[PDB]
């Protein structure tokens, strides 16, 4: 397994960028260090600068649900860019995507496009407080909602992988308004409301967690959050930046029948380009400028190129058999890894919903972040590296959910299961 | 001059998005409320969904410095997307753009790419505070950095002096647009930046230049290079994206090391450093490295600016402003404008009439008196001639 070129480039990048990467999640520090430099990706595969080919289960972290470099999306982008990539003024495509998002997401009646999930969440945070007139938020331990200050509290994703504390650089007076509770813990949330009467603007969360590994809400958890938030006139905010368009066309809210008041979107809606969005109940969105007083702008927001990527992507997802397929190949893969761990004598757990799955090296089961942290991180590290040598690219972290795409073939899955057999048999 | 299609599309957008736009200013609420919907842009022009063409001085708010849909940028993008638009892992192009940005901006020795100027600013404010262990940050009224904060009049060193004194050992640093564009075009008075650098070093505080708009426009190395004042941290955006969503923040190495995964301060981004966006930025900078780039911008823009002012002069309209490279401003007030309060004296009703007149003359100016104007390498001398000819007509009828 040669990673000569990757190491050469990564060594140079460390002198040019923090940690030699544009995002901490790509660090590889919890998997034995030494990230691999991609040269190109297509369908379910990625190719190293060293020429090594991998069956990719990262999908650039969610966006590539239609597969890498889908020809119809690339074709649409080629045609679109000839018309200029950014206008700085309104364009028809914004209306088209907006209309598509409004019809796809139950809670969304009005939407505002931004450029990333971080911007969408930061915006929804501001809108929650501006709408309710309350300053305190409730976020769950292990959930990640971008790096806006108030969200850097018991955050998952890179924060969990890198074992960092609540990020410094944030005034403690700002994080004071961020209350935290264990995921899947209603009573804890009930208690928080009782302790801060009239101060909770709302409850924000990943309706299905992917940033502290894969964690699904227990029966009644989402229904309960909607119930209690309604009781205190608090908003329920679904961060479907990762689950959006992946768990289902309408995300977790549609698939589980629980409708929030606001929801953020990202990744997939950008179809491979930088895009995000936040929307929800019309009466709440009307506070957003220029309709309302809450100022939120963006130079590249709603640019024609990004809108084209999003529209084409959603159009592909609307075709029949799409989510059926994702759940079909992902369940087999998921069941495979577990059946393999069992046979090879490794304590493991996890599951999957549509094209999103998780595999923990712990008997579990996992219901919250604390349960996830009990995974054998040393084992995962050896497992992640062995899979890499076997041609399988997994997220360099035990706290990141895995992704499959419409491009992964039954063949690719079998090959992935074979690799896992070989890797776990040697763990 | 019809805009039927624009009105219809905008009317429908108001039911789909707040104000029917993805960004406040686009709604034209400061100049009548009748926005024009773009279908395509090219070189120095923009086309309506109604078929109307305009000589564009917005340049999508800064990014289109090389001209709209530059054929060489589009080609690079086509070549690049065949390999996938986003990897989610390191790619060689990131090293390339990083090196170019490091070589281009004096203060940057290490850079971190993001997807917008707002992300850059969020991160830079938090880094300032993490590096100094202080919570207070000083900004200026009229300066924009996306959206414990002490304000102060722009071009006012004494007010800054007072802020440090009234908050001993609490000021992480001072952040500002080295040259203002978000409250109209306002240049720093002689010694202002030098002053800020002196006072910040004086109090072991950081100096941060928000060059999201000035970067690569005022000069290849932004204001810090042109005016020769070096901050500790700088944010970049707009032009580094070459028309795509890209931002960045960087500065002294020892400071940037605190950024994860190198340090404890967290900041991440799924689309950060994607090959497509890196390609757009790389091509854009390579084009700006060609001969006569900034000379040309400074030339046509000086003519434009002087022209507008001369026309206001000849037509009896109090006006002020000026330009630096391909960035300029025009205020309907005699000023001159040194800060936000000065800018606020401008005659907004007059600017609105002017904007609409220019629009009808085939000139697309920023739909706000408080926005700097921009030129591109695509703007020809004739475009400028046509523009001034239009400005004459409109101001004559104002
Ligand atoms: C639920 C949720 N909410 C908000 C975000 C941030 O969105 P953004 O990266 O587009 O800025 C995310 C980002 N997830 C991205 C990760 N898979 C790792 C990639 C990274 O951070 O660079 C998320 O999952
Ligand atoms: C444009 C601008 C920003 C905002 O950047 P976006 O890419 O719109 O998020 C920040 N600061 C300044 C000075 C700007 O001009
Ligand atoms: N900060 C706001 C302006 N750059 C306007 C962006 C737009 O609407 O295109």
PDB file of C-alpha atoms in Angstrom, chain A residues 341 344 346 359 361 378-384 386 420-427:
ATOM      1  CA  UNK A 341     -17.851  -8.738  13.664  1.00  0.00           C
ATOM      2  CA  UNK A 344     -14.792 -12.716  14.002  1.00  0.00           C
ATOM      3  CA  UNK A 346     -15.664  -8.464  17.877  1.00  0.00           C
ATOM      4  CA  UNK A 359     -20.707   0.745  12.979  1.00  0.00           C
ATOM      5  CA  UNK A 361     -16.755  -1.243  18.169  1.00  0.00           C
ATOM      6  CA  UNK A 378      -7.847   1.713  19.086  1.00  0.00           C
ATOM      7  CA  UNK A 379      -9.629  -1.132  17.360  1.00  0.00           C
ATOM      8  CA  UNK A 380     -11.452   1.267  15.028  1.00  0.00           C
ATOM      9  CA  UNK A 381      -8.116   2.821  14.097  1.00  0.00           C
ATOM     10  CA  UNK A 382      -6.617  -0.528  13.112  1.00  0.00           C
ATOM     11  CA  UNK A 383      -9.882  -1.399  11.359  1.00  0.00           C
ATOM     12  CA  UNK A 384      -9.971   1.864   9.409  1.00  0.00           C
ATOM     13  CA  UNK A 386      -6.877  -2.196   7.258  1.00  0.00           C
ATOM     14  CA  UNK A 420     -14.294  -6.220   6.272  1.00  0.00           C
ATOM     15  CA  UNK A 421     -14.118 -10.013   6.562  1.00  0.00           C
ATOM     16  CA  UNK A 422     -10.411  -9.899   5.784  1.00  0.00           C
ATOM     17  CA  UNK A 423      -9.792  -6.904   8.055  1.00  0.00           C
ATOM     18  CA  UNK A 424     -11.822  -8.055  11.060  1.00  0.00           C
ATOM     19  CA  UNK A 425     -10.438 -11.572  10.776  1.00  0.00           C
ATOM     20  CA  UNK A 426      -7.058  -9.940  11.365  1.00  0.00           C
ATOM     21  CA  UNK A 427      -8.060  -7.418  14.038  1.00  0.00           C
TER      22      UNK A 427
END
